[PDB]
């Protein structure tokens, strides 16, 4: 009832802030006809670490052309549109790239899905900043290569190529700071 109660309080307040951000992002996408047309690529959900925004490929509409870390026009549009809204709260963010463009776990001695995934996370980062994301908002960029694929190769594997933007709650941010500072 002591520390825990006050702990739960802060947790709930943070959730309410991230929940409002979630509704705000969904509304931004809905009210803009061009962004709404791109909604099939957007998946937003609340996770233990905060609020996750995934921008996923479709086979006919990839956010990055195969083998490239250059954003497509609609990818730039999505990122620049959400940027100012992400500034609505003080929370920092992490960007993670998931990529399977190149042969699965092959020729990893050179440029592979590791470099491409990280480069795509950073390309997305640059668009958020160009779109107005406050300086210092980003806390981490991650390349996950194809280690978190959601589908084996085939007609529905476009989901293996996606950019994940995680708006970190206090604990998640603290866990990251501790991870790189402890000892």
Residue from 108, 153, 156, 174 binding a second copy (CB under 8 A): 108
Burial 65-85 (b: 16+ CB within 10 A, else e): eeeebebeebbbbbbbbbbeb
Q: Rounded to the nearest whole angstrom, what is the least distance from the CB of residue 71 to a second copy in the complex? A: 12
Span from 59-67, 72-80, 114-122, 153-161 in contact with a second copy (CB under 8 A): 114-122
Q: Are 108 and 114 in contact (CB under 8 A)?
A: yes
Q: Is 120 exposed, middle or buried (0-12, 13-18, 19+ CB in 10 A)?
A: buried
The answer to the question of residue 58 lying near a second copy (CB under 8 A) is no
The answer to the question of residue 2 lying near a second copy (CB under 8 A) is no
Q: Rounded to the nearest whole angstrom, what is the least distance from the CB of residue 180 to a second copy in the complex? A: 4
Q: Are 35 and 81 in contact (CB under 8 A)?
A: yes
Alpha helices (H) along 32-86: 33-36, 73-86
**Distance in angstroms (rounded) separating the CA atoms of residues 96 and 108:** 19
Q: Which is nearer to a second copy, 36 or 111 (CB)?
A: 111
Q: Which is nearer to a second copy, 2 or 181 (CB)?
A: 181
**Distance in angstroms (rounded) separating the CA atoms of residues 122 and 73:** 16
Residue from 31, 48, 60, 66 binding a second copy (CB under 8 A): 48
Which of 6, 173, 181, 31 lies closest to 94 in space, CA to CA? 173
The answer to the question of residue 124 lying near a second copy (CB under 8 A) is no
DSSP tally for the chain: helices H, then strands E: 5, 5
The answer to the question of residue 51 lying near a second copy (CB under 8 A) is no
Question: Which token pair is 51?
Answer: 């609020």
Residue from 107, 153, 156, 174 binding a second copy (CB under 8 A): 107
135-174 mask for a second copy (x: CB under 8 A)? Answer: xx-xxxxxxxx-xx---------------x-x--------
**Distance in angstroms (rounded) separating the CA atoms of residues 22 and 24:** 5
| Interacting residues with a second copy (CB under 8 A) | 45, 47-49, 52, 94, 96, 98, 104-105, 107-110, 114-115, 117-119, 121-122, 125-126, 129-130, 135-136, 138-145, 147-148, 164, 166, 177, 179-183
């Amino acid at each position: 009832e002591k520390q825990p109660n006050i702990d739960e309080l802060k947790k709930r307040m943070e959730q309410s802030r991230l929940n409002k951000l979630r509704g705000d992002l969904d509304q931004l996408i809905e009210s803009d006809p061009k962004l709404r047309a791109l909604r099939p690529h957007l998946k937003i959900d609340l996770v233990q670490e905060g609020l996750r925004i995934q921008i996923i490929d479709s086979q006919n509409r990839p956010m990055f052309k195969t083998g490239s870390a250059e954003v497509e026009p609609y990818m730039r549009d999505i990122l620049r549109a959400i940027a100012p809204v992400l500034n609505g709260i003080p929370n920092r963010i992490s960007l993670a790239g998931h990529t399977d463009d190149f042969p699965y776990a092959n020729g990893e001695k050179g440029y592979s899905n590791w470099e491409l995934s990280a480069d795509r996370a950073n390309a997305s980062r640059r668009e958020l900043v160009a779109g107005g994301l406050d300086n210092g908002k980003v806390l981490r960029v991650v390349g996950m290569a194809a280690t978190m694929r959601l589908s084996d190769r085939g007609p529905d594997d476009a989901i293996n190529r996606r950019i994940s933007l995680l708006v970190l709650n206090k604990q998640a941010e603290q866990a990251i700071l501790h991870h790189h500072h402890h000892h």
